[PDB]
Amino acid sequence: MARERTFLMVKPDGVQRGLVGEIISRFERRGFKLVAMKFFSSGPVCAMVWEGANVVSISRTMMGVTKPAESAPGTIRGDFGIDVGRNIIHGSANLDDAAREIALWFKPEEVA
Amino acid sequence: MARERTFLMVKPDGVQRGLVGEIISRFERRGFKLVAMKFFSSGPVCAMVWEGANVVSISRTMMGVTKPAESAPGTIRGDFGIDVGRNIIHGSANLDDAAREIALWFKPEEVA
Amino acid sequence: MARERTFLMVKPDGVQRGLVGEIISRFERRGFKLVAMKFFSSGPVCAMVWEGANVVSISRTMMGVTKPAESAPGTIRGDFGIDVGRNIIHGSANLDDAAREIALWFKPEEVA
Amino acid sequence: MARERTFLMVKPDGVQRGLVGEIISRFERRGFKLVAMKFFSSGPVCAMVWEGANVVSISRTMMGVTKPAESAPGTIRGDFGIDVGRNIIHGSANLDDAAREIALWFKPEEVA
Amino acid sequence: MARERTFLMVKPDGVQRGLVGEIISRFERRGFKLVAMKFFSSGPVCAMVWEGANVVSISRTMMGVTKPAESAPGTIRGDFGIDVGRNIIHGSANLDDAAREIALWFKPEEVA
Amino acid sequence: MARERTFLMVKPDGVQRGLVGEIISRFERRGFKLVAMKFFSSGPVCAMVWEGANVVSISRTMMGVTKPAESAPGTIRGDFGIDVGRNIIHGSANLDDAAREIALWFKPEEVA
Ligand SMILES: [Cl-]
Ligand SMILES: [Cl-]
Ligand SMILES: [Cl-]
Ligand SMILES: [Cl-]
Ligand SMILES: [Cl-]
Ligand SMILES: [Cl-]
Numbered sequence: 001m002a003r004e005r006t007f008l009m010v011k012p013d014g015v016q017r018g019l020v021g022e023i024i025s026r027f028e029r030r031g032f033k034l035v036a037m038k039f040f041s042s043g044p045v046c047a048m049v050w051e052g053a054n055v056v057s058i059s060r061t062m063m064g065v066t067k068p069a070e071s072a073p074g075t076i077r078g079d080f081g082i083d084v085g086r087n088i089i090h091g092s093a094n095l096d097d098a099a100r101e102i103a104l105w106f107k108p109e110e111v112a
Numbered sequence: 113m114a115r116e117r118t119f120l121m122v123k124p125d126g127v128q129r130g131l132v133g134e135i136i137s138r139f140e141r142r143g144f145k146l147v148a149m150k151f152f153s154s155g156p157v158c159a160m161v162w163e164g165a166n167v168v169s170i171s172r173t174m175m176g177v178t179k180p181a182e183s184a185p186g187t188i189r190g191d192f193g194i195d196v197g198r199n200i201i202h203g204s205a206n207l208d209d210a211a212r213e214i215a216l217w218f219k220p221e222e223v224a
Numbered sequence: 225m226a227r228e229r230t231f232l233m234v235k236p237d238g239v240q241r242g243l244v245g246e247i248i249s250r251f252e253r254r255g256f257k258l259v260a261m262k263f264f265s266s267g268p269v270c271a272m273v274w275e276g277a278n279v280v281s282i283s284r285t286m287m288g289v290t291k292p293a294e295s296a297p298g299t300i301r302g303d304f305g306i307d308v309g310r311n312i313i314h315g316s317a318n319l320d321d322a323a324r325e326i327a328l329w330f331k332p333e334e335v336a
Numbered sequence: 337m338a339r340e341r342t343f344l345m346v347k348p349d350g351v352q353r354g355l356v357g358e359i360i361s362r363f364e365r366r367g368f369k370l371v372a373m374k375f376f377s378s379g380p381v382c383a384m385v386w387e388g389a390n391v392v393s394i395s396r397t398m399m400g401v402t403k404p405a406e407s408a409p410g411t412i413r414g415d416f417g418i419d420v421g422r423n424i425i426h427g428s429a430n431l432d433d434a435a436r437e438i439a440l441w442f443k444p445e446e447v448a
Numbered sequence: 449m450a451r452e453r454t455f456l457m458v459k460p461d462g463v464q465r466g467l468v469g470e471i472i473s474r475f476e477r478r479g480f481k482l483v484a485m486k487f488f489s490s491g492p493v494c495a496m497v498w499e500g501a502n503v504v505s506i507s508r509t510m511m512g513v514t515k516p517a518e519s520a521p522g523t524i525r526g527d528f529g530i531d532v533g534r535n536i537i538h539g540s541a542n543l544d545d546a547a548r549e550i551a552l553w554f555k556p557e558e559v560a
Numbered sequence: 561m562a563r564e565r566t567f568l569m570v571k572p573d574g575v576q577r578g579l580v581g582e583i584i585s586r587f588e589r590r591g592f593k594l595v596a597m598k599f600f601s602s603g604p605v606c607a608m609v610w611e612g613a614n615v616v617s618i619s620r621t622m623m624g625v626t627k628p629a630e631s632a633p634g635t636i637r638g639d640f641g642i643d644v645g646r647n648i649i650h651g652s653a654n655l656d657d658a659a660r661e662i663a664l665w666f667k668p669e670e671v672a
Contacts, residue, residue: 020594021585028578031306037606039597044672046597053307054293062297069166073174074186074298082143083165112604130364137357146356149375149382156448158373181278185286186298194255195277224380242476249469258468261487261494268560270485336492367530389531390517398521405614409622410522410634418591419613479642501643502629510633522634 002053005035006092007101012043013086020046023076023089026062035112038105047105051112056098059091114165117147118204119213124155125198132158135188135201138174147224150217159217163224168210171203226277229259230316231325236267237310244270247300247313250286259336262329271329275336280322283315338389341371342428343437348379349422356382359412359425362398371448374441383441387448392434395427450501453483454540455549460491461534468494471524471537474510483560486553495553499560504546507539562613565595566652567661572603573646580606583636583649586622595672598665607665611672616658619651 008027010020027034032052039046050059064071068081076089092098102111120139122132139146144164151158162171176183180193188201204210214223232251234244251258256276263270274283288295292305300313316322326335344363346356363370368388375382386395400407404417412425428434438447456475458468475482480500487494498507512519516529524537540546550559568587570580587594592612599606610619624631628641636649652658662671 015594018585018588021581021583021588023581024584025578025581026303028581029304031304031310034575034580034599034604034606037597037599039594044594046594058293061294064297069170070173072186072297073176073184073190074296074302078186078297079138080141080143086143127370130361132370133357133359133361133364135357136360137354140354140357146351146375146380146382149373151370151373156370158370181282182285184298185288185296185302190298191250192253192255198255239482242473244482245469245471245473245476247469248472249466252466252469258463258487258492258494261485263482263485268482270482362527365528367528367534394517397518400521405618406621408521408634409624409632409638410520410526414521414634415586416589416591422591474639477640479640479646506629509630512633520633522632522638526633 003051004053004055004095005049005051005102006056006059006098007090007105008048008050008059008092009090009105010046010048011086011088011090012045013082014080014088015044015046017080017088019080019088022080024048026076027059030058030062032059036106036110038110049102049106049111056092056095060093063089063091115163116165116167116207117161117163117214118168118171118210119202119217120160120162120171120204121202121217122158122160123198123200123202124157125194126192126200127156127158129192129200131192131200134192136160138188139171142170142174144171148218148222150222161214161218161223168204168207172205175201175203227275228277228279228319229273229275229326230280230283230322231314231329232272232274232283232316233314233329234270234272235310235312235314236269237306238304238312239268239270241304241312243304243312246304248272250300251283254282254286256283260330260334262334273326273330273335280316280319284317287313287315339387340389340391340431341385341387341438342392342395342434343426343441344384344386344395344428345426345441346382346384347422347424347426348381349418350416350424351380351382353416353424355416355424358416360384362412363395366394366398368395372442372446374446385438385442385447392428392431396429399425399427451499452501452503452543453497453499453550454504454507454546455538455553456496456498456507456540457538457553458494458496459534459536459538460493461530462528462536463492463494465528465536467528467536470528472496474524475507478506478510480507484554484558486558497550497554497559504540504543508541511537511539563611564613564615564655565609565611565662566616566619566658567650567665568608568610568619568652569650569665570606570608571646571648571650572605573642574640574648575604575606577640577648579640579648582640584608586636587619590618590622592619596666596670598670609662609666609671616652616655620653623649623651 064075064077068077071077176187176189183189288299288301295301400411400413404413407413512523512525516525519525624635624637631637
């Protein structure tokens, strides 16, 4: 229940605006252990796997709601979000979407 | 709908406490383009016009509620607010108050 | 009603993780005057008394809810909290718990 | 000797990258009083007049050297500078260049 | 040689400007363990004892030079210093001044 | 001369202390484009390739000197360094060490 893991990815707009570090810091500060990371349509992305108790739903709270017009200040989208097109970041919706998203993006050796 | 514009002003207490930059940064980070700025009862103020989709209601969310005792951490008043007398900042209430507040404080050449 | 005072304490996990300064800064930025401070089971702690209008309930808002899985980003636990065991910080629950907690931890000369 | 004043300006590249607030904050934190501000070839700029003891030479130290390849971390160019073309910011070289730069960019009523 | 200890104190001007937390954070980030702390002419002060390898000379580097007109950006005085009157902070000059300053300001039980 | 590239790596102590994001942010803010990234004796590491004019010598300046007792505040080691054992970060010494370090740690497809 603390071996729990989610997929996170800095969308091209996050990368282009210089927000990769800021996003990582946010998770480091909550205590989540980073487990894997790669820097792969239009723009490069930063795919990450993070681990900790409740990381899946907590990190969704941390991101804020899909529509940054409504996203709470303190959240990533609440602090940095533009519009819904350029919403900076993706994080797995639930435990099933996490397991599938992780495996899609990584070889299993790549993950701790 | 993205040519939208609001009036913002750092009240004398914001200026006196050294919060002008912090306030601007907050808006720069959300992606709003600054459009005009001047530094004019008791204490100097910093009047600004900002532009972007939904800037009017988003920036109100960003400020927090009038009563910083109740203002959410992450918002300007939630992070920096003292009492309701010294509430740091003013931002236009709605699209009508914005158009009027902008024109009151600026010559039209002064605005982009 | 502005002579109001609360007890705050950085739990051993807050101290061990290097968060004392960050916690103080948060309160300094809201305008609360620090009134007393000492750095005393397992791990050292930082006990503080803070003063200002509504400091008791405001600082509880600032901390976030007991369960950092649910704690709002922008709050201390929302930004830094791990699990409910390691919840970083304690703050007096109400005006009675404040007066008792202050007196328990300080000699009265120690308080301003 | 504390009525001293300099001209500062965020070049178009500073504005485009969202660094106006960060730059102001830097000066607010040193204790300089902002005295005037306007937001006017290619890109908008932010012209400012700042006041305090030794503000002219101190702010040059704060900016760092013209060549950000050599600019010291902690300085504006040391933290944010790209190349010498895009060097973010301009500040008056000496007390004579300050008086001339201020008057060039402002009406005298505009300055405190 | 890592049991080394210095005295540090936030002068009244540091306290009045809300810089206690910022100062502590700086030391926490370098890895120094805080060992004791009290919050005692004109204005309250924050006296601290910090411990770590070379803490005495390192923390002097961290403060910057006595004359903030010349103090390096990145240092406390370089980032926050006003003039030499209001120079924010005091730190022991050398290992002898440290041992004496610590004992002057603390009972020995008060120190870890 | 702007296609220049260096190797950077957050040592296990940087990772364990939660400094990966902070380190990346530092480079994003200088304008360097991240080009590749993986998260691989004792402790996990974060290997990165960064690109920009003079990135090799600039990033060495940004890190500070090998001996954090002497490392300048504003630099990574100056702000976060412990002792020379735990010096947080590695960066290629020169253009030859960069080309070799990059190829050692990456497949060439992995690099942009
Ligand atoms: Cl999404
Ligand atoms: Cl209002
Ligand atoms: Cl509790
Ligand atoms: Cl220039
Ligand atoms: Cl002194
Ligand atoms: Cl090395």
